[model samples]
Target chain A: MKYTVITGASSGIGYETAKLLAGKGKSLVLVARRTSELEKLRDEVKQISPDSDVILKSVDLADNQNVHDLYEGLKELDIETLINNAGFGDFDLVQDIELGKIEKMLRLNIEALTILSSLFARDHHDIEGTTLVNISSLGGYRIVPNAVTYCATKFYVSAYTEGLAQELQKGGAKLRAKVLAPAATETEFVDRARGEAGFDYSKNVHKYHTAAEMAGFLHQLIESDAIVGIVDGETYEFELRGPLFNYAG
Target chain B: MKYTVITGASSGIGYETAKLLAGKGKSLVLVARRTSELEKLRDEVKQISPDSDVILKSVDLADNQNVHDLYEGLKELDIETLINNAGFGDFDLVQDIELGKIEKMLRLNIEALTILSSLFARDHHDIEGTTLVNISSLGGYRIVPNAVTYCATKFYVSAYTEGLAQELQKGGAKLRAKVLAPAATETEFVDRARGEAGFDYSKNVHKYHTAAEMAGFLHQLIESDAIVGIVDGETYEFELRGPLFNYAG
Candidate 1:
């Protein structure tokens, strides 16, 4: 069976994508730092599609050994797709940002993502119906006042994903790679961006879109052969090949 | 007296920019890990324009405390222009790439640049003639086969700098930010990319430009009110705001 692997599958986009895929009768392998959450998610996904196989794995992708082991451990499965949606950001003045926190973010956002992307690209470069999806942000395409570092990380994701897509297109490769630049959504992301504690969500409740709404929006575009999926903040809608960057190389 | 600060000032573009700025009668504060090389650079700048004030500081910017100390220490000087050029890249597949090497690169390229950019933005938001020039790479705008991680780091630079420039333009701020994506030039970068000794430059000798040539090209675009200075790979020439990325935020 060609199984789809989703990182950060415990909540937010990962969980939402899993549910969507489960409903579509796609077998899934869910990975996250929290096993209990993954177990519950697997149960829910199975309930959505009783015939689809659902597996759960608990591993912190930030750890080098864990990431290395993950690739090796998953060799038994014929992985068809990789959804790298496991990234976090913090809001702080750059200097005021803690070094350890920043390091952790870098390890997970850039390094771990790179490891997975590279591995999948090498293994599935010629494989049809294989795709690599990395979630970025509107912040990824733009640098904000209080989120320079966070934006930079997402920027890396956007460029790396799009650049690879260009390479695949130029080569006429069947394997697809795309980036999803979602706007602010009603998820743990908003609270997690505070750098430490959760600010009141009610303060700017209307500014955020719900997780289910975003998932439903993504369901419409997940199979398209596109470089970027630009998300509408309020409506939770999307446009393909968007925030069109000029690449002259 | 407002001074231009260039990190990675020991060699390559940093050294070339130092000399170019010195010729323009701009005072300078050169920083790098090696004190001896910086001392020589200062002397050469002193010789280039006797009236120019050339100061040198040797500190490994990868260290958090060291970068913090340098920023705090330089508060006495009225810093005007900052060339965030202290960066390096290594060549390897993502998983095969060394962790320490990538970490060092991330610390210097992403973290150090962000810290300096944010600090400079806060201090020089509305000040006329204050500019932040970040050196990126052609790789920043594209992804190659073997240098995925390195390309991602430079991509972060390109997006981060461009996005901020958009914010400044929309806000009508006097302070300017520019990202310079230079092409391959004759430098220690290729050697450093292997995380070892220098490779045969003569093999692809025609592909690289001299450091002095690139500096001259940058000198022309340095003062332009453009977000990106796209350098031509073959000639080492530049065009301001070329391939100007659409920052939708």
Candidate 2:
């Protein structure tokens, strides 16, 4: 039986992706820092596909050793798909921010994501129809104030994913790498953004994704070989705003 | 006397900039990890302008505490200009690379550069004619295989510098933040690149800037009030390489 490993499987797109994959009768290996949340997701996936095997691992992806150990323990599994979705961001003026927080953000968002993706891609290279999806952000294409570290990490993801895609193609591996840069989605992200000054979280912006909507898009991308990657809907809107307002605004 | 602080001041553009600034009679504060190199540079600056004060503090900018301590030490000094130039790159396939090395690269190239610039900009906000010049890379605007993390760090530098430019302009702080993205240059960088696999360091590429040429361009930018920021000659060449060949090459 093929297995799919989803990081940050506790909530948001990770959870949604796991549900969709479970519906397809694939075994699931759900990994996240929160064990309780992973247990909840396990029960939900079981309800969708009672016969599907579900393994829950509670590990902090930010710890390099933990990521390495996770890969070692799961080496025997025939993993077909790997979703790197665990990430965090802090919004603050660069000057007023704590250096420790910035370091932690980089460790979790970029280091952990890259290390896990690399490990999975190498270990599962022989598997047919293998796929690796890296979650980037809309801010990767443009720079924004108060989101410096976050933007940096996302840009790294986009650039690194593109490089990996080219490599897999050149190496004759039946593997694919996709980077998805999404805009503001309805998630707990806003709660973190509220901690920073000058960010008006209360101001009503346009509607955000329902988590299901984003999951649906992601599901289509994974199932179809034609779609390599995609910039979020809001990113398209921002681009249409023209060069003057697209980034400057 | 106005002071100018420069990182990676032992050689290359930093050394040249320090020489030029000292020739203009500006006091200098030089920071880098090499104490011997810094001492040699201090002597060179002293010979140019005997009255110019040159203070050397050797510390690895990658260390957060060291960077913070540097800022703390500079609090009493009247700094008017900052040149952020310390960065390094290693070219290799991501999957086969070591994780710890890449993490350190990001910490030095992105984390330290951003933190130092933020500190200097905030403290020097009230000082008239205060300016910052962050040295990025032409690779930041484009993507290259093997140089993924390096390019990512440079992209961050460009984005963060631009964001700071907008903030200062919007706040009417009378401060200037300029980003310089340079392409291949005649520097020790080529020697460093020789160790990386698949790169022919001996191959003759286009003639790059002399240290003098880059320093001259930076000096001109500092002297011009209309020129808020600049993407130097090398950057222009890479930007004109066209979009398709830009990132993929």
Candidate 3:
């Protein structure tokens, strides 16, 4: 049976998306740094769809070796869908952001994701009914004041995935690539982004989508033919469309 | 005297831009890994404008420590312009591209530039007459089949700079950030991008711009009020415009 591989499956949109996919009777390979959380997710998914196969891979994507090893072990599997939903952000002024954290962010957000995309595409681009979804940010489309570096990383994701989408279409490849740009969703994002600063999402954020809602958006993108599924920052309306950026040559 | 700091100044667009800036009586700090080439450019610039302070910095921006040290050593100077023109591309299928080279490309293209931009923006955001120009690629705007990974790096550059330009304008910061997305230009790019493959530019490419022409476009960008100056891949026309990407809150 073909499995849908989801990164950062321990919590947030990835976790919610995993459950949604499992409920739809799709077998899943759940990956995260937190093994206990992965076990819990596996158990939950199994409960929802008893016959569905749920594989747990405890991987710290922030580390380069772990990223390579994780992919090497998974490349042999009949993976029909690859979702690069693992990434983080730091909501601080550029100068104030720690270089160490930035390094890890770059490693996980750009480097690891890129390596995995490359490997997966090489193996599955010609395979029919395959899909690749990379999760970007609204900041990826527009730059936020405090999240300069973080947004830059997401920009790479949005652009890379969008461009790859075009390439795949033009090349007559059976595998399709799509990007999901979620706005400020209520998840672990606020906690990780704030760092030392205490963030009360309910108090600070006026309007935001829940993780489950974002999971629904992800599911829609996977099932639809749209190349981009982005949540409008102002309207908070989720819209699935063509390429977000203008293309030349 | 306020200096115009240009990275990758030993060759290509950076080299030509240094010469043009020296002609305009702008003092320059030229950075490159090739010390001998940098020395040659320095001598030439000094000969053109003897009064211009032409400081040569032999820096390999691909290294993380060197990038930090290079900026730390220059942060004390009265720099008026920061041109992040140091970047490379690898033209190959995603699976065929070497990971080691991709690592170096990411380090130089994204990490080093981000760090330098952050440090420079922090020090000069309030200072009047400071300009930051980041060099991207046509592939930055659109994806090319063979150079997916390389284009992703430039995509980061384009997005970051565009978003930064907006933030600076809204914040009323005196410093302005701009991006130059150059198409296929005659430089060491062909050598580096082609890797071991023998690439005959004249035979392969129907049309391209010279390094000097791109350098001239950069000068125009510095003088104009535009946030982006991009070269059309098909028309080979250099056009200055506002933001190339869409923005949200």
Candidate 4:
């Protein structure tokens, strides 16, 4: 069966995107850290489209072994789309931020993403109609002051995905690599970043769009021909762009 | 006493940059993982300029507390220039690369650099002569296929430093934040990257610049008034450029 695998599908944008894809008659292999949440999402996905098959994998993506095994076991299904959306952010002064958190963030946001991307890219680079969409952020393009590490991680997402896109095009591969850079939509992102020190949303943010709205924009991004998909926070509309960096040797 | 601290000062670009600054009459506080090499470098700096005060600190910069203490202890001396030149690169397909290496690389390259940059930027943003010079790579701007993680780490460096620069300048701070992206040069970098598997350099690189030549480029980079300083690997000349990304938000 053809499949669309979305990591971090238990909550936030991942879960919403799962529902949207299922509604479009896409089979989903939803992955996350919580089995209960995955089961819940699985049930919801089944209800959204009874014709669509849904598989749930409850494993910590931060573990390299698990990421390796995941790709190893995924050979049975034809995965048409890979949405690497599993990531988080932390906000605080650099020293004040917990060291453990930084390590965990790097393992999940950078290592896991790279490993998974490599596994798929190596095998499917020449496959037609296959796509690898890495979920990035505006922070990926423009750095924020206090959110240094978080911003850097996003920058990695942008650079890696765009570079992969360029390399694939240069090699004359049919596989598509794109980055979906969403602005601060109404998601768990703020709480995830602020962690329990408390964040007042009304004081700073100008607006918040629901996850459903974001999922809608994501579909448009996937269909667009641009190498990068960036959504304006003020307008909340998706715009596509070319690679940000040139081939500077 | 005014001082310039060079991390990874025991060898390679870090050592070369340290010597160049010492020749220019800058007092030195050199940091590295090895105590013996730092002392040797310290002694050589003293010989280069008998009047220059050279201090050596041997600590694992990957450790959070070590980085914290390094900055904590820098208060006594007027830190006029900070050259964050310590970091390593690993070349391999992402999945083939080891996980432990990625964590350590991020800690030193991303975490240590950001903490030091923040500590200095917060307190000395208005200090006119003080500069935060981050040693990045051409990889920061572009991604290499086999060196994904290494390239991403450099991307973080460029984004974080440039972002801080923008924030500081926007806040009307006089501190100049800069990125020095040197192309692949002659160094122990190849041996360090290849690890046990021997690498044949002649097959890959068309040209190589000595560490001293890179240091020369670095001195010119600092003297030139530019936000981004990158050298063409072929021409081996420093070229200044504007910020790599715009605020997409």
The DockQ scores of all candidates, in the order shown, are: 0.30, 0.33, 0.51, 0.34
* Model 4 deviation from native, Cα RMSD in Å: 4.2
Write the residue-wise lDDT of candidate 2 on A67-111 in tens digits: 888889987888888888888777776556666677777777877
List residue ranges in candidate 3 displaced over 4 A: A196-203, B196-204, B233-235
Candidate achieving higher DockQ, 1 or 4: 4
Estimate, for each residue in B1-249, the C-alpha lDDT of model 1 and write its tens digit. 779999999998999999988888999999998899999998999999999988889899997668878988889999889889998887764435566677678778887887787778767778888888888887787566666667778988887787666666666777788888888777778878876776666786666767887788677667675677877665656677643544544
Docking class of 3: medium
The collision pairs in model 3 are none
Candidate 4, B48-122: lDDT as tens digits = 988999988888998777998989998888988898998888876543566567667877887788778877876
Name every residue pair that clashes in candidate 2.
B143-B247
Query: Please, what are the lDDT tens digits per residue for candidate 1 over residues A59-115?
Result: 999876687789889898999989888888887654356666776787788768877
lDDT of each: 0.79, 0.72, 0.87, 0.81
Writing each residue's lDDT as its tens digit, candidate 2 over B96-194 gives: 666667677777887778778778766776678888888877666565656665676776676666666665666677777777766666667655544
Among residues 3 or more apart in sequence or in different chains, the pairs in candidate 1 whose N, CA or C atoms overlap within 3 Å are none
Please provide TM-scores, in order, for all candidate models, with all chains considered together. 0.79, 0.86, 0.92, 0.81
The candidate, 1 or 3, that scores higher on DockQ is 3
The best candidate in terms of DockQ: 3
What tier of docking accuracy does candidate 1 attain?
acceptable
lDDT of candidate 4 over A212-232, digit per residue (tens)? 877877787788878888876
* i-RMSD per candidate, Å: 4.1, 8.3, 2.3, 4.0
The count of residue-pair clashes in candidate 2 stands at 1
